[PDB]
Design a protein around this ligand. Structure first.
Ligand SMILES: O=C1c2cc(-c3ccc(O)cc3)cc(Cc3ccccc3)c2C[C@]1(CO)Cc1ccc(O)cc1
Length: 192
């Protein structure tokens, strides 16, 4: 049986369109370019000013987001246009798949652990549906509650039932990196 997919699919037009949609979502000022300063500011602004992160939590979360978008070639003080963005995302996905195969903590998992410690009011690495609605709407990556509910349908939720970083890292492997058909609708209709 197929547990996952460790092969890239960068020529898939739906993979390009998935991250082009994300690029336009991150380019809120329609400059055609985004910077690491803007991404980390957005990330820290959410957890600090919307989710009540402690200074210790925000520091760990900041280093995780910084390493994530930095893995796509984004740097402080440097503006990244779309050609340099999607090319850097090929390098990010390639490096993450190497960490997946090596059973090495990936950048997307480290971000999830740091973020879920903030989003989970119990700080046990497991978020409820309401907490997932609270983060994704604050970040804006999901706008409707209907699409947030699709996430908990796609994910193997536990008996609570909450979503943990293990399951979300499994779904993000196929959604952001390898275009796993079983990971479709992970963000509902919010992300193509
Ligand atoms: O993954 C996530 C993501 C991805 C992307 C993005 C971006 C570009 C792209 O080209 C493809 C994908 C974007 C976002 C949005 C964002 C938040 C803060 C700062 C900047 C952006 C998220 C959040 C989120 C949840 O949606 C957090 C998370 C990770 C790991 C985990 O286990 C659980 C939750």
């Amino acid at each position: 049986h197929h547990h996952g997919k460790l092969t890239s699919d960068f020529d898939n037009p739906r993979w390009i369109g998935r991250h082009k949609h994300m690029f336009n979502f991150l380019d809120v000022n329609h400059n055609g370019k985004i910077s690491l300063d803007e991404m980390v500011y957005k990330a820290s602004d959410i957890v600090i000013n919307n989710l009540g992160a402690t200074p210790e939590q925000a520091k760990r979360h900041k280093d995780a987001v910084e390493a994530f978008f930095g893995g796509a070639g984004m740097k402080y003080g440097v503006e990244t246009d779309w050609p340099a963005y999607i090319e850097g995302w090929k390098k990010l996905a390639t490096d993450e798949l190497e960490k997946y195969a090596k059973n090495e903590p990936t950048l997307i998992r480290i971000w999830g652990d740091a973020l879920f410690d903030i989003v989970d009011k119990d700080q046990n690495g497991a978020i409820t549906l309401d907490e997932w609605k609270a983060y994704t709407k604050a970040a804006g990556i999901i706008q409707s509650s209907e699409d947030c509910e699709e996430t908990f349908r796609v994910c193997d939720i536990d008996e609570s039932g909450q979503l943990d970083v293990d399951e979300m890292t499994r779904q993000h492997l196929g959604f952001w990196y390898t275009m796993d058909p079983a990971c479709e609708k992970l963000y509902g209709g919010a992300v193509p």
